[PDB]
Design a protein around this ligand. Sequence first.
Ligand SMILES: *[C@@H]1O[C@H](CO)[C@@H](O[C@@H]2O[C@H](CO)[C@@H](O[C@@H]3O[C@H](CO)[C@@H](O)[C@H](O)[C@@H]3O)[C@H](O)[C@H]2NC(C)=O)[C@H](O)[C@H]1NC(C)=O
Ligand SMILES: *[C@@H]1O[C@H](CO)[C@@H](O[C@@H]2O[C@H](CO)[C@@H](O)[C@H](O)[C@H]2NC(C)=O)[C@H](O)[C@H]1NC(C)=O
Ligand code: NAG
Lengths: 271, 274
Amino acid sequence: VVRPEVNRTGTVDICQGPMELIFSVSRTSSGATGERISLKNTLSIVSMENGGKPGTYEWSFPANESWPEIQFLLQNREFVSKYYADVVQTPGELVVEYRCPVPQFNCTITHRWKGETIMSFDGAIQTIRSVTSEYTTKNEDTLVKYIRGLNVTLLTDNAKSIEHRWTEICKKLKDADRPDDNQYTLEDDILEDDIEMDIVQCQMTTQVPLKYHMTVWSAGRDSRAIALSAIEVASYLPVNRSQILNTTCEITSSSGWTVRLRFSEEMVAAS
Amino acid sequence: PEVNRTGTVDICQGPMELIFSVSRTSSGATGERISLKNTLSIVSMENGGKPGTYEWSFPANESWPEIQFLLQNREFVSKYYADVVQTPGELVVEYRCPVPQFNCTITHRWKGETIMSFDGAIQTIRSVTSEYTTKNEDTLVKYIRGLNVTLLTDNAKSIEHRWTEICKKLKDADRPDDNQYTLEDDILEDDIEMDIVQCQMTTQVPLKYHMTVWSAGRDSRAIALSADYYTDIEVASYLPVNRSQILNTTCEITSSSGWTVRLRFSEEMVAASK
Ligand SMILES: *[C@@H]1O[C@H](CO)[C@@H](O[C@@H]2O[C@H](CO)[C@@H](O[C@@H]3O[C@H](CO)[C@@H](O)[C@H](O)[C@@H]3O)[C@H](O)[C@H]2NC(C)=O)[C@H](O)[C@H]1NC(C)=O
Ligand SMILES: *[C@@H]1O[C@H](CO)[C@@H](O[C@@H]2O[C@H](CO)[C@@H](O)[C@H](O)[C@H]2NC(C)=O)[C@H](O)[C@H]1NC(C)=O
Ligand SMILES: *[C@H]1O[C@H](CO)[C@@H](O)[C@H](O)[C@H]1NC(C)=O
């Protein structure tokens, strides 16, 4: 455990600018399912994992299955299962994602297969990217049944109600975003059998689902490891044990702050 | 076939770059390619075959040091793969090399995703190790920097000269009217409101191509990029279309040399209940 050095220069207002809600609905070959709601600069705030109850964080409203945004997700779970069942003929994850300006809700929808975009729709242009064989023996006509996704009437009927709720949620997220309350770790001695080489681990634990970018730099800054949040953030750098000192870790948030940790001579001595 | 050559560039201008791509699969399939910065591969080898190239170029000579550098990397990647990769997938090592000044960049890709890189001063690992390796980042870093480019630097100017001539022959070979273009419906035989319009282009010129098939309203499109099947160039795109709106579906092909080819599904072409 290590104490953060908080560089706040380049701080942004996460609740500033136009509001955007991101609805992500995924399915794998196993039958694993996910439904998530995020904001523009956040990871998942409300989620449902393999058909469980809507889950969230202790700094926000309890997640309610009767909320019109979650009813939207549940309808999509159904849609994606039917979708998955005709089209998908090789194993892999299918992701349908709505990017929704609020209070309209003229949404963009992206379809990803194994992380790649196979289709999209901005309500003006439908796009199919030509890679079908990769994941199906069915043709573009089948695919185009699903391209537009589901109607968003549930969202637009309650458009304003949804807005004031997620403005409230973002405001709670901003209040919870306290960099000094996250937990920070700088572990060495991960290669116990290697006499000359070691791995330096940097980890952060948080209950705030902002996007995080973690870089572990070597002493000379000629070697780095990069991780992104997925809520644990962890990254691992191979290092020479005689150059473990001054190896740093830098973490930047989606709210604009930057934490740096340093492997000090205090920590070298105790090792 | 409606060719537009406004904006055509000189693909052999600016500083030259050679791109060396070397791949291995779990089943032991392999690929080694050389391309310029604005092309797909010009020389390639597939599953250990002899170098293959195009009708317009020098016969691919296996004794060329650039090609020896590819075979040398075949050995590197086999060793790399054996002790790093513990789950099925394609590993690609890619050198981006300025010529004649061979201060190269190297990228590593697993399943199409970048896992490691070394540019000038800085080695980068992206921490996704525990998805392709049971082993540790200290194993990886044995391979990050790749091979010494000594085969390339020893022969720097000869390579520059050879590839300057290959680039000119390619630039000369790039002749849109000598490519083969097809625009075709009647793919969906048992469909009442729907058809598929297929746009295809066959070429011996390994430029990068971007293909869009547009509906009559420019409100629906299919996009295909030229894919490189090892000295084999596929550009094919398929657009689902309402049969009643098939007229004026247009296909639009753009090359990395700057030209665009439009193919329109014309009134004349609709006249056909064959
Ligand atoms: C969803 O609806 C919003 C509006 O409610 C659309 O946003 C608007 O998009 C237009 C066209 O891109 C923007 O107009 C542009 O404005 C810039 C800056 O002033 C100007 O220089 C450009 O020439 C252009 O006219 C407009 O700013 C923007 N409005 C707002 C309030 O954001 C959006 O495009 C819709 N999205 C979808 C997926 O349909
Ligand atoms: C389909 O596209 C063709 C080609 O653009 C259209 O033909 C044009 O029609 C206008 C009006 O008569 C003329 O000004 C152009 O000179 C024509 N172009 C050519 C090349 O013949 C045609 O109008 C379109 N068809 C439909 C049904 O809209
Ligand atoms: C190496 O070549 C020269 C050195 O001055 C420079 O222009 C270039 O940025 C370098 N290239 C890379 C990618 O290492």
